[PDB]
Design a protein around this ligand. Structure first.
Ligand code: SJT
Ligand code: ZN
Ligand code: ZN
Ligand code: ZN
Lengths: 21, 816, 67, 81
RNA sequence: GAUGAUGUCAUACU
RNA sequence: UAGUAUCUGUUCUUAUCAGUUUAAUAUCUGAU
């Protein structure tokens, strides 16, 4: 479900925020 | 009887004034116009018992005073036979404790004076000039001062000239000089054009045989000088030699009044004469330093504060001549037991440090920081606080620094009461020392930890507050291990049952996290935050605010060590606190929710919020709406609008109204940031503005208003013009909340697109045959005109002349 | 409603244009460059222009119509 | 329902229940300009009281940013009567 | 192709 | 709690003018 991919989505958001900055 | 009929009608009118809604305006207007017909007799006969009624409320008193003012203005010379009786009735009001009671008394008396004239006032008030009772004379003196304020000082000047030199009794001279004093006190700087005349009129009284006349003359000089500050010193030339000689002879309260007059005269002088004169009076002042009577000591302290604050009195003179006896005779433990002496000596000493230098004053009292008398310690600490808050610590050397450290340590350790003065003093001294308190910081944190382990929780609260106050300087001193230990002890004290101390502990923890950082923090964040999670449901606002701010800073700069599920749990608990009454908790909640949304991804929290949006249909839906806006302002809105608009395609309607309300508040909240998202939400707004449901039209108009006001001046004119074409046809809607939202949208669009476009939409129906169309379009025109009157000049259409009138604005048709 | 120059569904053409002209004259006397333009067009001082506009404030569109 | 008299030097206040609210449009977003009220609404026992309920005032009343943009701060004393 | 107005209805949302 | 909206039911001579009112109808008031 979404709970298994929640950490992957958070990591993808952190990677996007690192790439945007 | 006709008089009884008059009485009954006046009674009915006064009743309509006091208890009526309007009715008050009409009744007020008619009683001023019919004043001469009623006569001053029945009017004042009924008004005076009502005015002095013991059960009257303040605003009722203001209403009746306004009634009195109106009826007095038309009734001029008819009030004369009753002025004396009016006076006997009213003059206890002039000494009432209520300030507004005295203002209304002075206003009534001044209106009486301007209605009856100066002649009847002097003729009326003369037999009480030499009355035996002091309070009647005081009332008459205040009344004469207000009369002088009404008719002007020169109009009453010859009466004072005659009365102040009366050969018959000292009471008349005393009353005239008291009149001059009250004139000064009442009119302030307005006495300056006639200040010379008043001083010349009263100056002879200083060498009078009667002591009370000399005293009231000195007090009147002091009042005139205070009112004239900082001007008018030249007008006092002729008074300079008597007073200065008088203090070489008089003693007691007379000498006190003379010195007070001198102390108010000195700051008006230039540097040379101020120097000369304060050197002339310092011997008498220092002699009076040891007087036992407290009023004299207060007055001399006030005078030293005044004279030391004057330009021309050099710092070395104060150093060598003034400071040793001052500190030897005034700074004793006896004077610290009365509040007025306490406050006055503190302010005087601070003004002294303001002029002669901070260290010069500070070094003379630091050791008294270790006196066993706790009240003395509090006084000296407050003095140091005010002095150091004005000037800083740049003047303090190493020796005095160590003296200060030892003194504040001893004062903080031997503390038995929860004094906020000790807390603020410790905090400001340490924060002013800056990186210089670095060698003393171990024992200091030891004492804070000592007070952190006190059996009584209020001492612990004070210690935590001190931690929060000094965390920044402790960081810039680089002692992060003691700070970490402090964080560990506070975390061990997080199960505290008393809410204010726990809130202070949370504030201290926020300070410790801000100074040490999230990576080197002890305890780890992964253990700290779950401990903070159950504290969010506490009902006290201080614990709530502090814990929310702590969670927000943790989410801002140290969210690495916390999983996304714990942050979602925090968000779920935080959502309800957006509707709090206290604005500080709401602001903290907004900040913390934004930090969490910035830290974690948008997708999961946004999904939860949209789910909430669909399954609530209740009051907290707007809470959810606010949270969506927070996500959009803190994170980027392109992470919210796709999912928000894809959820809009479900045909359940109530969800669509929720989406629209969310968009409205979102645009209102993000403001200028929405300028890049007008096109993105334009099709949905097109859909909603043409939908059959009228609630959709109203909320969409709200979105248009918030949008137009948010993007004002950033070039979105065409998209708003397009949305204006869908907002406009709803101007004939009958539902009040809808036409209200339409008018709000039209006003926002007037701001954003300009009044010219709105006027272009308006001009056809301004003179439409249908009255309903004219009502609507003239309402819109009224809104545009009130908002944009001067701009419309450029936007009015060309209206041609006819056979009777000229309608062309020919000036605008000029071409050079 | 208490603001001079606003209107309603019974506003006549004469009153509306009188309001327009008075608003326009006050705007000319406020906006320095409008009055500058007008004082360059004719050959009159700015004070004379201000005087003329003030005399025009009494009846800028002439006497009104009946009914 | 608004007083709408000529405001003076008196500073409008808000109670603890409405701290941060805009008195014209009820919005809580972006306060901008300090509220001034007429002298009659601040006279006597009325000084420092809430401009919405007349209760005790604890903070300064503000017009929101949207109201000042639309010049709704220039319409007179907003004390509700 | 012009669906308005009213209540004893009845049913939904605030 | 009491406000709105949607279905059901009703919705007033295929006999002629004037007056109030209406953007015009409609409504109301009088005469044939
Ligand atoms: C004057 C009052 O009208 C009096 C009274 C009794 O009126 C019924 O109480 C009013 C208070 C109402 C409150 C506090 C309503 C809660 C609302 O909560 C929603 C979710 C909104 N919240 C926000 O806008 C929150 C945060 C914003 C973004 O940030 C800030 C700093 O405000 C609005 C209301 C607060 C009282 O006004
Ligand atoms: Zn007011
Ligand atoms: Zn209030
Ligand atoms: Zn507002």
């Amino acid at each position: 479900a979404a709970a298994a991919a929640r950490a992957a989505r958070a990591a993808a958001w952190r990677a996007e925020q690192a790439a945007a900055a | 009887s006709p008089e009884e009929q008059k009485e009954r009608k006046i009674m009915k009118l006064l009743l309509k004034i006091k208890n009526g809604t309007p009715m008050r305006k009409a009744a007020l207007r008619q009683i001023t116009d019919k004043a001469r017909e009623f006569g001053a007799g029945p009017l004042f006969n009924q008004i005076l018992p009502l005015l002095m009624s013991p059960t009257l409320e303040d605003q009722e008193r203001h209403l009746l005073v306004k009634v009195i003012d109106r009826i007095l203005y038309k009734l001029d010379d008819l009030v004369r036979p009753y002025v004396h009786k009016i006076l006997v009735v009213i003059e206890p009001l002039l000494i009432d404790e209520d300030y507004y009671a005295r203002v209304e008394g002075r206003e009534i008396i001044s209106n009486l004076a301007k209605a009856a004239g100066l002649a009847t006032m002097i003729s009326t008030m003369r037999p009480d000039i030499d009355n035996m009772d002091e309070y009647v004379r005081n009332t008459t003196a205040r009344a004469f001062a207000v009369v002088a304020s009404a008719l002007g000082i020169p109009s009453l000047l010859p009466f004072l000239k005659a009365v102040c030199k009366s050969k018959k009794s000292w009471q008349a001279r005393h009353t005239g000089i008291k009149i001059v004093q009250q004139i000064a006190i009442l009119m302030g700087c307005a006495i300056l054009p006639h200040l010379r005349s008043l001083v010349e009129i009263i100056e002879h009284g200083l060498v009078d045989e009667q002591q009370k006349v000399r005293t009231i003359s000195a007090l009147a000089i002091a009042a005139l000088a205070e009112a004239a500050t900082p001007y008018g010193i030249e007008s006092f030339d002729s008074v300079l030699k008597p007073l200065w000689k008088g203090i070489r002879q008089h003693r007691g309260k007379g000498l006190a009044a003379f010195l007070k007059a001198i102390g108010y005269l000195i700051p008006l002088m230039d540097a040379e004469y101020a120097n000369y004169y304060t050197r002339e009076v310092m011997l008498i002042l220092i002699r009076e330093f040891q007087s036992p009577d407290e009023e004299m000591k207060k007055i001399v302290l006030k005078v030293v504060k005044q004279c030391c604050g004057t330009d021309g009195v050099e710092a070395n003179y104060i150093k060598t001549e003034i400071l040793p006896p001052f500190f030897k005779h005034f700074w004793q433990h006896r004077m610290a037991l009365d509040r007025r002496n306490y406050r006055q000596l503190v302010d005087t000493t601070v003004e002294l440090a303001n002029k002669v230098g901070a260290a010069e004053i500070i070094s003379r009292i630091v050791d008294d920081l270790k006196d066993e008398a706790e009240q003395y310690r509090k006084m000296v600490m407050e003095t140091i606080e005010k002095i150091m808050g004005n000037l800083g610590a740049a003047d303090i050397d190493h020796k005095l620094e160590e003296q200060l450290i030892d003194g504040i340590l001893y004062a903080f350790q031997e503390q038995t009461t929860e004094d906020s003065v000790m807390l603020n003093g410790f905090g400001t001294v340490v924060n002013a020392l800056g990186k210089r308190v670095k060698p003393y910081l171990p024992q200091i944190c030891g004492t804070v930890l000592w007070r952190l382990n006190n059996k009584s929780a209020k001492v612990r609260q004070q210690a935590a507050d001190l931690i929060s106050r000094t965390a920044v300087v402790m960081k810039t001193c680089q002692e992060e291990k003691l700070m970490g230990h402090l964080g560990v002890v506070l975390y061990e004290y997080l199960g505290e049952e008393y809410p204010e101390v726990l809130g202070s502990i949370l504030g201290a923890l926020k300070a410790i996290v801000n100074v040490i950082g999230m990576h080197k923090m002890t305890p780890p964040i992964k253990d700290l935050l779950p401990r903070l999670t159950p504290i969010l449901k506490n009902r006290h606002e201080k614990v709530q605010e502090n814990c929310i701010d702590l969670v927000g800073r943790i989410a801002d700069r140290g969210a690495e060590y916390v999983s996304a599920r714990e942050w979602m749990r925090i968000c779920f608990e935080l959502l309800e606190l957006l509707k709090a009454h206290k604005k500080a908790i709401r602001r903290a909640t907004v900040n913390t929710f934004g930090y969490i949304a910035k830290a974690i991804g948008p997708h999961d929290v946004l999904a939860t919020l949209l789910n909430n949006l669909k399954v609530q249909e209740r009051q907290n839906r707007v809470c959810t709406t606010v949270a969506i806006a927070i996500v959009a302002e803190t994170c980027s809105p392109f992470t919210v609008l796709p999912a928000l608009m894809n959820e809009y395609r479900v045909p359940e309607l109530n969800v669509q109204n929720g989406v629209l309300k969310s968009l409205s508040f979102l645009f209102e909240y993000i403001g200028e940031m929405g300028k890049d998202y007008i096109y993105a939400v334009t099709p949905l707004l097109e859909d909603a503005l043409m939908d059959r449901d009228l609630v959709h039209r109203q909320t969409a108009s709200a979105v248009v208003q918030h949008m137009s006001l948010g993007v004002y001046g950033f070039g979105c004119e065409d998209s708003l013009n397009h949305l204006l074409n869908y907002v406009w046809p709803n101007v004939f809607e009958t539902s009040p909340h809808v036409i209200q939202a339409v008018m709000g949208a039209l006003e926002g669009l007037r701001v954003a697109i300009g009044p010219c476009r709105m006027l272009q939409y308006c001009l056809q129906g301004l003179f439409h045959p249908a009255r309903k169309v004219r009502d609507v379009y003239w309402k819109i025109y009224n809104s545009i005109y009130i908002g944009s009157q001067d701009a419309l000049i450029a936007h009015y259409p060309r209206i041609y002349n006819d056979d009777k009138n000229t309608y062309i604005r020919y000036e605008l048709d000029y071409i050079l | 409603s208490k603001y001079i120059g606003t209107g309603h569904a019974d506003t006549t053409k004469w009153e509306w244009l009188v309001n327009q002209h008075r608003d326009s004259y006050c705007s000319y006397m406020g906006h320095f460059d409008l009055l500058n333009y007008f004082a360059i067009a004719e050959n009159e001082s700015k004070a004379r222009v201000r005087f003329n506009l003030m005399e025009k404030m009494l009846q800028p569109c002439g006497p009104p119509a009946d009914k | 329902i608004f007083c709408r008299k000529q405001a003076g030097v008196a500073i409008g206040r808000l109670c603890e229940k409405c701290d941060g609210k805009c008195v014209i449009c009820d919005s809580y977003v972006r306060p901008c300009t300090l509220v001034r009220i007429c002298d009659e609404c601040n006279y006597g026992s009325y000084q420092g009281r809430c401009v919405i309920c007349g209760g005790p005032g604890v903070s300064d009343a503000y017009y929101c940013k949207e109201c000042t943009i639309q010049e709704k701060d220039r319409d007179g004393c907003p004390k509700i009567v």
